[PDB]
Design a protein around this ligand. Structure first.
Ligand code: NAG
Ligand code: NAG
Ligand code: NAG
Lengths: 48, 241, 98, 48
């Protein structure tokens, strides 16, 4: 018999690497003094 | 002081479930019948390839640990502690201050005095034992609880060390420290080496017995036959060089 | 600015899962564990946590789905040879197959 | 006993890489370009 179809299954989505305070933030910085906020262990949703 | 670690310090090499096969592995284990360097209730101890930490108390006086590679200044350093409740883990490169012994009523605040570019955070008659390993930037912890009645000796018996957590922090730990809760007005330590064992399983749960097949000739013979029972006869085990 | 260090990767993208299927020959992939076989619910319980059970001859035969924590069973997809039963070409041409 | 032991050490040999990258084919298949993965696949085929 042959495989009907291929399936992949992975655990739930954890903390979503908050980008709302980086893109949808209120006040940005000036060029000569720029922020360097670094992300860490989480899932990055580059599709959005 | 010194004592003998009879048959303690056995964890699960991996997460696989095995029904009843008597499986033989090869990993870093605490050798059977070795000295532990047990203390009283505490200098720095070298973290070579992993340690076995055990504690016997009746009151919640033993507290978390501090790890590192230089233990002086400006380097990556693990720091696991515990208050009255909600165990907090704080694992970052920073200027850790000293050895903050806890001072007891509930009024206990002497921990640290420095903060810098932290990289990780976490907020959440008995025998508690732990195993710490530093493999490929992963820090694995195994833990188990065991009720006891005598507290001046290390009890006899077997218990597997179910995995607790894992952390991806890349670090090369070399020494560590321990924390107590002395008032204001007994922990075991052992090292572990690459060995070979014959963990049992029982299809209804977990490991029930093991044999270190490098200790004595019967261990080697059992390890060869892959069974805990040996029948009368002569068995060729290994070579002598 | 993505960066690559000797430390293990921590920030990595999401993986799209799918609704599992039972009682069919499929290609499974559970957190890297792949292969094929018929998926069936188990009559056995692992532990408060275990990922995948093996057996003698170190074959993977029991896994748990990391959404409902339910242990499943892996059975190889049906295979076997076919045999031809014939009474002789001169006698007749009827054929039974096994 | 001998027949079962031989048939068991036969199927246990499937988890040996014979000096290749891995024992499983589906990982060396989807982790290398075909032209060099041919060498690994051949080196595993010979051992099996
Ligand atoms: C522990 O070391 C001492 C010497 O330092 C030795 O006499 C003793 O036999 C050792 N313990 C074991 C269990 O070998
Ligand atoms: C073994 O399994 C049975 C049910 O299959 C269960 O009743 C029993 O408690 C188990 N033994 C343990 C958990 O020691
Ligand atoms: C087989 O076929 C030949 C010619 O077709 C015939 O002479 C012979 O009797 C046959 N034998 C049997 C057993 O059918």
């Amino acid at each position: 018999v042959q495989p009907t179809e291929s399936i992949v299954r992975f655990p739930n989505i954890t903390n979503l690497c908050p980008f709302g305070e980086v893109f949808n933030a209120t006040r940005f910085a000036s060029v000569y003094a720029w922020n360097r906020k670094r992300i860490s262990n989480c899932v990055a949703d580059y599709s959005v | 002081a010194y004592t003998n670690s009879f048959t303690r310090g056995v964890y699960y090499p991996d997460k696989v479930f095995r029904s009843s096969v008597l499986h033989s592995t090869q990993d870093l284990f605490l050798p059977f019948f070795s000295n532990v360097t047990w203390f009283h209730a505490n200098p720095v101890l070298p973290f070579n390839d992993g340690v076995y930490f055990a504690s016997t108390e009746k009151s919640n006086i033993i507290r978390g640990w501090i790890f590192g590679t230089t233990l002086d200044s400006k380097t990556q350093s693990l720091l696991i502690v515990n208050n009255a409740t909600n165990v907090v883990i704080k694992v970052c490169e920073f200027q850790f201050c000293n050895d903050p012994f806890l001072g007891v009523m509930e009024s206990e605040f002497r921990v640290y005095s420095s903060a810098n570019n932290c990289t990780f955070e976490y907020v959440s008659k008995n025998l508690r034992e732990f195993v710490f390993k530093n493999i490929d930037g992963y820090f694995k912890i195994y833990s188990k609880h065991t009720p006891i009645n005598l507290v001046r000796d290390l009890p006899q018996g077997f218990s597997a060390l179910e995995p607790l957590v894992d952390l991806p922090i890349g670090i090369n730990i070399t020494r560590f420290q321990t924390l107590l809760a002395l008032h204001r007005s007994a922990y075991y330590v052992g090292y572990l080496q690459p060995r070979t064992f014959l963990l049992k399983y029982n299809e209804n749960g977990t490991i029930t017995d093991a044999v270190d097949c490098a200790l004595d000739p019967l261990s080697e013979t059992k390890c060869t036959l892959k069974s805990f029972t040996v029948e009368k006869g002569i068995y060729q085990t290994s070579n002598f060089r | 600015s993505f960066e690559l260090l000797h430390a293990p990767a921590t920030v990595c993208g999401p993986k799209k899962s799918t609704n599992l299927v039972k009682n069919k020959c499929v290609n499974f992939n559970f957190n890297g564990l792949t292969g094929t076989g018929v998926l069936t619910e188990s009559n056995k319980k692992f532990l408060p946590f275990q990922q995948f059970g093996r057996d003698i001859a170190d074959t993977t035969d029991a896994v748990r789905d990391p959404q409902t924590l339910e242990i499943l069973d892996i059975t190889p997809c049906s295979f076997g040879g076919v045999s031809v039963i014939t009474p002789g070409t001169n006698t007749s041409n009827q054929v039974a197959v096994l | 006993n001998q027949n079962a032991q031989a048939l068991n050490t036969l199927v246990k040999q499937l988890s040996s890489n014979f000096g290749a990258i891995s024992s499983v084919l589906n990982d060396i298949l989807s982790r290398l370009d075909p032209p060099e993965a041919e060498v690994q696949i051949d080196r595993l085929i010979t051992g099996r």
